[PDB]
Design a protein around this ligand. Structure first.
Ligand SMILES: [Zn+2]
Ligand SMILES: [Zn+2]
Lengths: 530, 530
DNA sequence: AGCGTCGAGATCC
DNA sequence: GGTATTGGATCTCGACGCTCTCCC
DNA sequence: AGCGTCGAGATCC
DNA sequence: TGGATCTCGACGCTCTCCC
């Protein structure tokens, strides 16, 4: 509401008590960013929404005031697994916490009810799913009794973004949760989310029936992470060898994740690494749940060095010693790449995030996201991040997050910052040639895939598609691909999707801004290295 | 920028429209806004039509299908609505088909073959939004048909399903934008019975349309007679009033009695049957065969009265429903309008009679405690009930935000039929007495139900709950209940919900505006007759 | 656990 | 010398059945 | 319609 | 004057994840 900075203090009456617990129960010397501000706000009896990247320590901001308080804290969690994660951490720490779920043993629930009402119960955190609030009259009655007895005074709503349709995940159950603030007004409410917008947070505030809400957003920045973008090799076996050279080289004996675009990609990459002596395991949704759990367990135990995964991997990733995250293919958006890379270096020590940029991955992902209304837009933002050879990776991420950034805050931690040595290349004539090829194709009633267009540029492919006088520059194929990608994201070329029986395919067509080429003073410049 | 401009028949298609209408559909005239929507659609321009159920929505997209060359794609969330449209269209002889989740595989090949076929007589294809989202084959066949200029019309039923804030929310609808992106030259019509400004803007966003005509039909149904009656305290007396209605003015006429709860429907059905009425109970807990049998007996007029919860309402096309009686008030104005509007679909005169009971307020209030706006729409319904002067159509118009003329009702509601003859009564001292009773209860640590409050007011009930000097006025119990209801919806008294093992119950407590009584000049007035 | 209902048992006139 | 209901209403208590509520 | 191996098919030696 | 491996072309099931 006003500012998080006002709360980054320890002159509050409980502030000493906050600190005993921080160092004593939780055994942490210092507070992670925005943890102290959120905890102080909660202890002041003030509803707070905390947006914080996964692995930044969200759970602490509601777990610590629970031992600072008197009775128990009610946490609403959408999935049973997240509740199990928190419960495991808490049992290890020694805090008494319990969980109620849809099909829990009948007598576990009777015990939970008795503990809720109990006058001197040691139970400190109760985790429930949203239907326990929505549909269980007994649990609501016990919550009301506990509240009247001043043993229930804190509410934590995990995945608050689930209130809004505009959030990635939406749970209908969530539209009940407002009853909490209505039934227990003296209980302070905290909403926790990794990803949220102003619209999503305002929606959640509407659903939760909250009048005034502090809104604290943590920085995207992870200072220990080194961000790099490399050329994706044309040869798949050459790419696998480069990966093995990295793993046996910099990352010998170090755990890591390789993110892959497709399930077949994950399986093939895992097979290739296994045949080259790397202990790697594939993870994707089509795997059996037992197989998934086995792979996760072996990786966490370090029996498996590398987990080759799609976006399916992401269940409770708490591994702190992930030294490298490699993207075999680019993610579909800046959000996804940020979340996937951020699984590295949770221990706050140095870790590397290495991304492989390939021309064809753009169109794999574009055909893929054709159903998402903004899928092409976020994909093209990812593409622009990949195309950049001058700007700092942290600066681009900050633009993406609408976050205030300092140019010199990257501080040697990305590949562009460690290399001016670049120059500008005029590529207008390449655009005119490509448009000529496209026009020849459309007169012959031919649709051109990016491969057909680039081949016609290079003089290969079907002869009829070739244009007289069009000679490609003497550049590596990747340079021609980068030029075409720039024309695409700059809208001189556009994607035209076609739906066929087994697949969705991308064609390239004349873009909106191509008419600008009618004027010869028109110029198009791309940065290259010199 | 307004439909009246489109209320013409000088367009080139206007001849084809009217011939086809009178010939294929055998209807001489159009209901309001049908030709206008048809003209805008026929002008190849996406239009959103908000029109009440039973007003003839399906025709506005079915008629231009036969005016055009190839076929129209209709998007329908539920299979049942699709069956309804298919039976009407088959009876007329128009070839329309439906593809659904579990359709025969050979039905799918026949549908695909018809889609590609060049001279197919198929005019309307009904599919669910997942058919678009997940079927690569259906999209390929749609693209082939579209390129052949045989697929040029899209109808999206229940566009309000795009928004979470809509009455019904479907996640599948967020794929539907692909249609406009893949088939921009295909005209889109969106159909909905219920929508707000928020919902239409959300749906327009989701469907990726940046330009939309918006035609909203009037709520008004001139043939319907709207009445509100006092719900008798005695259940057997209430059943007698109903039998007097049914055997009297509605002898041999079909009708619906809407009930709050499923056993209420059951009790009322038993009572009507034992008194010689052919009545049938309808609620969600019935077996599907029972539902269809009851619907069939009612449609054949073998069952005169259908005693139903809100479950009845599926595809109600019975045109000769002469009376709809509300045994209990609906939970909202929206619901009461939809439930009453099933009467007089034949456009002949019909009656909507509502029975208002003090205890129904709290029955419904406890039921909707989980709905974030449930109490608010219930209280709006209550205010409609409390009114004894204003025209019912005016109250509905306020709910619908529709411009209305007071005298357009034309003797067609109970309040309009009594004509001033009303006056204002100052009831402030009653509020002070009730607040004293409430203060004594909260100091004695006692919770008061509305019945307990009325008993203390009347000098009955527990002696300890009574306040010295508080004597209730010599009025019928209904009048004290109405005074308390006025205090409640005016928020001088408030509901306090308590959750117990078997039920959620309402207490009455001092409301937010009670501090206003501190001014001694403060007055609270309720309208009465002289 | 709690509301709403209804006799028994007091008190009075 | 002492005086106030083989009754007739009335509080005024305390036990004692339901509770389970729409819609997908 | 599309990418990639793999036959078919040449002319030349 | 026969058949070489090296260019095409063909059309197959396609190659897209999980929220
Ligand atoms: Zn940098
Ligand atoms: Zn009227």
């Amino acid at each position: 509401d006003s500012s998080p900075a006002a709360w980054n203090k320890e002159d509050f009456p409980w502030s000493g008590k906050v600190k005993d617990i921080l160092q004593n129960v939780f055994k942490l010397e210092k507070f992670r960013p925005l943890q102290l501000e959120t905890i102080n706000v909660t202890m002041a009896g003030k509803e707070v929404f905390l947006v914080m990247p996964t692995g930044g320590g969200k759970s602490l901001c509601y777990q610590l005031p629970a031992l600072c308080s008197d009775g128990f804290t009610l946490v609403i969690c959408p999935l049973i697994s997240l509740m199990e994660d928190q419960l495991m951490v808490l049992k290890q720490l020694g805090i008494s916490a319990t969980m109620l779920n849809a099909s829990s043993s009948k007598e576990h629930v009777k015990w939970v009810h008795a503990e809720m009402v109990n006058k001197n119960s040691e139970l400190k955190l109760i985790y429930v799913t949203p239907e326990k609030i929505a549909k269980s009259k007994m649990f609501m009655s016990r919550l009301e009794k506990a509240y009247e007895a001043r043993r229930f005074t804190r509410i934590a709503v995990d995945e608050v973004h689930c209130c809004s349709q505009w959030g990635h995940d939406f749970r209908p159950d969530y539209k009940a949760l407002g009853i909490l603030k209505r039934q227990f007004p003296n209980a302070s409410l905290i909403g926790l989310t990794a990803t949220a917008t102003n619209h999503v947070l305002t929606d959640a505030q509407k659903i939760l029936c909250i009048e005034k809400c502090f809104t604290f957003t943590a920085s995207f920045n992870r200072p220990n992470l080194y961000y790099e973008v490399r050329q994706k090799p044309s040869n798949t076996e050459d790419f696998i060898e480069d990966i093995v050279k990295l793993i046996n080289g910099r990352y010998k004996g170090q755990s890591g994740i390789i993110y892959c675009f497709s399930q077949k990609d994950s399986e093939q990459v895992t097979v290739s690494l296994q045949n080259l002596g790397i202990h790697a395991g594939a993870y994707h949704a089509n795997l059996e749940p037992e197989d998934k759990t086995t792979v996760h367990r072996k990786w966490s135990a370090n029996e498996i060095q590398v987990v080759v995964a799609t976006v399916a991997f992401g269940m409770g990733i708490d591994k702190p010693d992930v030294r490298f995250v490699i993207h075999h293919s680019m993610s579909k958006s800046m959000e996804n790449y940020y979340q996937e890379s951020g699984r590295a270096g949770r221990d706050d020590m140095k870790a590397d995030c290495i991304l492989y940029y390939g021309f064809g991955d753009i169109f794999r992902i574009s055909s893929m996201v054709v159903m998402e209304n903004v899928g092409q837009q976020k994909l093209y933002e990812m593409v622009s991040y990949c195309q950049n050879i001058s700007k700092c990776r942290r600066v681009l991420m900050a633009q993406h997050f609408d976050e205030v950034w300092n140019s010199e805050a990257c501080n040697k931690m990305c590949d562009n910052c460690c290399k001016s040595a670049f120059e500008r290349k005029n590529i207008t004539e390449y655009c005119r040639d490509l448009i000529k090829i496209l026009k020849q194709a459309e007169e012959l009633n031919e649709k051109l895939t990016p491969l057909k267009l680039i081949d016609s540029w290079m003089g290969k492919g079907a002869a009829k598609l070739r244009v007289a006088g069009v000679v490609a520059p003497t550049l590596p194929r990747e340079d021609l691909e980068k030029i075409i990608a720039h024309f695409l994201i700059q809208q001189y070329l556009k994607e035209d999707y076609s739906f066929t029986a087994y697949a969705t395919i991308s064609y390239l067509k004349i873009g909106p801004k191509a008419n600008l080429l009618n004027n010869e003073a028109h110029a198009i410049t791309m940065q290259v290295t010199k």
